[PDB]
Design a protein around this ligand. Structure first.
Ligand code: HEM
Ligand code: HEM
Ligand SMILES: O=C(N[C@H](CS[C@H](Cc1ccccc1)C(=O)NCCCc1cccnc1)Cc1ccccc1)c1cccnc1
Ligand SMILES: O=C(N[C@H](CS[C@H](Cc1ccccc1)C(=O)NCCCc1cccnc1)Cc1ccccc1)c1cccnc1
Lengths: 446, 460
């Protein structure tokens, strides 16, 4: 089965029997996608076990997969198992169960629902400053992902459920240990039904239990029309069950906690290593919001440099790393035959650092996204939230929540490196995009 | 154990209680046919069972059958039950799915047009003479005759010459390798725990596929795989089954491995199906001497002085069409028709979930007492033009129905009728006591007799 790309005439690294090219993952997905981008060119292919993966870098071809032929050919991502009751999650669902869930959860982040969350988020922005003030008045490096993670958890648990959870919170402790042996499912695709029909999962049964019974506890009502109320009103009318309702809550809680804090930690590292960017960003926040005025919905979208700082960080650190779609039937997009079953992959990390696009890609330059220069970026090359009908459904919520946190913090504190601050920042050579050592920074009050 | 074993309980559809893991496969000890017969009597028009964990919905309503086979073929009921491990034979037209089958069906449909079929009558007429002489040596002696052997040799010669233009069996050669390999090409026996465990535990399929394990034996596939490669003799044609695939190959297209996959399907179907039905027909003609005489009287009336059969005289013989149809009613060699419900639908007021296998019990419907008077009896008068109006084409489906019916139906009807004519022109058939009367069907997988059909041959 390892002679597919040889048949189609698509280049790529030579696969080993059974393993394929997974031995090249010792450096991580990022370095493997970048080495293959320079060694082979615009299009290459490799094998995750027996699964052929076609990597495309042409923006016209990326648009065809993500946007044009989404509902027809490239609808679902790579099959992930063994899951179990998590097969009904919107990020894992396929075809019609996804389309019905995509439509059900889309009204969660409209321009009106997002504008309702500003006063709710404004409460936790003050606790974020007070907790940073205690570690700033006393000389002590601050683990940013811990203090940012506690803020991100309270935001998503209130904007989606209205419940207040307020250092050893069992939600943060259980949500974080969804973080080895996946080397086997990449090589054993036939062992998925062995664990599926037998009811075996990858997620530990306790991180699911704590959340499965917490949603059944927050569901006690007795609102505000939030992420939980949208799923209850349709439940009281195919339809959603008490198990699928829990499956969506785990996705929103994990995405609101882990993705928000990790990007915020990456932003503060770039601001500390570039004091000229942090100082210039602080001057814009003070101008739009004088006297430390509370940030509102409209004042956030007004700040251009704040949007340029977030965009450049998401360019350097795209937490998704890759974009993937499963070719459901034989197609010939942009004059290139793609058989059914091939996983079409877009190397987002490798494309965000392509020298043939970004001048000095390893450099942190927020001026790439200025309105003078944001005309020279391709929306299918810079894809930190994906694209098409199956992009990030919470892109607008994530961008607003992180900017509200960056405003409230940069109004009161400046961030400097420490002795133990890992400069330059080393990315985790493992699976997900994270720093090797935790991000520690000195917090000086203003 | 269960997982799905509550589906038909949820839908209110009756059926036998399934055992954990096994489902209802324990009830297959009597075969497909006797199990479908008892279920149709016990549970009525619609019932469901479980081939392991696979829910199977059996339908008997002609309108609902028409919706599955004809109306909703391209949109819902396109593919058959997934059969594995097949390996490279996945590209076979009878096994292909979705667009691949759609491209193959259109590619192979011009094989059996009325023009192409009429061109085959002179070719078949040659082997009809060898069939008589081979039957004559055994006729001059009171020695019994195993009809599956002599009809299988005739069928193998017709399928190799009309599809590839190659003569392999030169008057026999009774040790011909094409017949020896096609014989053991596939043997679905419930006894063999292989096909048993495949149904009970289907997650073993991707294991055997990557293990290069195939339900078709290696030595049999190799013999046919290299024979087709040998069967390519161009430059040297005549536009047959092989030429239609060669011409489209020299223009996606069909690879030298898919071209072999279709040949194996046509070779087996032309050898096994034609010879089996011919043996079933001759058994009924011997056990009913009144039908055999009336058939011989019509053949002599249309073809006097043993005139050679032509494409038009075959379609003229009405009683010959009645005998072939009544035998196909009693012995539908497929037994069942199956389609996989690719998405949730509600046909004729009945919800069918995605993944359920909708099955049409052709054997049970052909013997349904609420349609056929004396269904177990061999009465060709059911198909007379006086009575053929009272026959629902969705109850009597020996070749299936819809876009994915038997693509070689008209070829099989012509090839068998061309054989019955030339045989009955020169011989009459009688039982032998060693002939199993009544004919017991094989309680195993496929529709076959227990003891082979043997008959006495008398010349005229
Ligand atoms: C900086 C923050 C975030 C980034 C960079 C990010 C990025 C992404 C990307 C690249 C995808 C896949 C897009 C594609 O395949 O085309 C995705 C999917 C998704 N994201 Fe996010 N995300 C972020 C935060 C969030 C948050 C806060 C939520 C809250 C609910 C969320 C919910 C989802 C969901 C549900 C999906 C799957 C949607 C679907 O498959 O239909 N994400 N995200
Ligand atoms: C008395 C002889 C035969 C009978 C009763 C018979 C019966 C059937 C039946 C019931 C089906 C399934 C129809 C359905 O599922 O709706 C079928 C399919 C098929 N038959 Fe036959 N058959 C016979 C001979 C032949 C011959 C001689 C060929 C030569 C090529 C052939 C080739 C096929 C093929 C290729 C299919 C699959 C059709 C598809 O998937 O499109 N059969 N047959
Ligand atoms: O990485 C694979 N699949 C991916 C994993 S699904 C994954 C399952 C899961 C993991 C951890 C905690 C809770 C649930 C999942 O729901 N995450 C989306 C939820 C959070 C998020 C993150 C980033 C952006 N927005 C949202 C599919 C995917 C969907 C959307 C964005 C990124 C990735 C993979 C790799 C090799 C072989 N097979 C599968
Ligand atoms: O019987 C199963 N599948 C069958 C598909 S495979 C089966 C595999 C095979 C066997 C022998 C030689 C070569 C290939 C196959 O190609 N035969 C059809 C080819 C010859 C034929 C027979 C009768 C009428 N015309 C044509 C269903 C079927 C389709 C079309 C016609 C007849 C039957 C089955 C049973 C249990 C579980 N799963 C599947």
């Amino acid at each position: 089965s390892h002679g597919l790309f040889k048949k189609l005439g698509i280049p790529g690294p030579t696969p080993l029997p059974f393993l394929g090219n997974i031995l090249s993952y010792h450096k991580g997905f990022c370095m493997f996608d970048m080495e293959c981008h320079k060694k082979y060119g615009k299009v290459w292919g490799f094998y995750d076990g027996q699964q052929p993966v076609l990597a495309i870098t042409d923006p016209d071809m990326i648009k065809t997969v993500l946007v044009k032929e989404c509902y027809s050919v490239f609808t679902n991502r790579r099959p992930f198992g063994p899951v179990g009751f998590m097969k009904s999650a919107i990020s894992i669902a396929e075809d019609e169960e996804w389309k019905r869930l995509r439509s059900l959860l889309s009204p969660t982040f409209t321009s009106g629902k997002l504008k309702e969350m500003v006063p709710i988020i404004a409460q936790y922005g003050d606790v974020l400053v007070r907790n940073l003030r205690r570690e700033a008045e006393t000389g002590k490096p601050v683990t940013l992902k811990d203090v940012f993670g506690a803020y991100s958890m309270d935001v998503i648990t209130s904007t989606s459920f209205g419940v207040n959870i307020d250092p050893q919170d069992p939600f943060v402790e259980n949500t974080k240990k969804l973080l080895p042996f996946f080397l086997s499912i990449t090589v054993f695709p036939f062992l998925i039904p062995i664990l599926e029909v037998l009811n075996i999962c990858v997620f530990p049964r306790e991180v699911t239990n704590f959340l499965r019974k917490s949603v059944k506890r927050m569901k006690e009502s007795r609102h505000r029309v939030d992420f939980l109320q949208l799923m209850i009103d349709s439940q009281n009318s195919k339809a959603l069950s008490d198990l699928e309702l829990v499956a969506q809550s785990i996705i929103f809680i994990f995405a609101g906690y882990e993705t928000t804090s990790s990007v915020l930690s990456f932003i503060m590292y770039e601001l500390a290593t570039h004091p000229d960017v942090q100082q210039k960003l602080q001057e814009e926040i003070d101008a739009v919001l004088p006297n430390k005025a509370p940030p509102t919905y409209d004042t956030v979208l007004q700040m251009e440099y704040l949007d340029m700082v977030v965009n450049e960080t998401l360019r350097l650190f795209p937490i998704a790393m890759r974009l993937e779609r499963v070719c459901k039937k034989d197609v010939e997009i942009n004059g290139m035959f793609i058989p059914k079953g091939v996983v079409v992959m877009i190397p987002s990390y490798a494309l965000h650092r392509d020298p043939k696009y970004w001048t000095e890609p390893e450099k942190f330059l927020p001026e790439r996204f200025s309105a003078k220069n944001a005309d020279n970026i391709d929306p299918y090359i810079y894809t930190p939230f994906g694209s098409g009908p199956r992009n990030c459904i919470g892109m607008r919520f994530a961008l607003m929540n992180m900017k509200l946190a960056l405003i409230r913090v940069l109004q009161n504190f400046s961030f400097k490196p420490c002795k133990e601050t890992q400069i330059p920042l080393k990315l985790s050579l493992g699976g997900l995009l994270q720093p090797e050592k935790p991000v520690v920074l000195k917090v000086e009050s203003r």
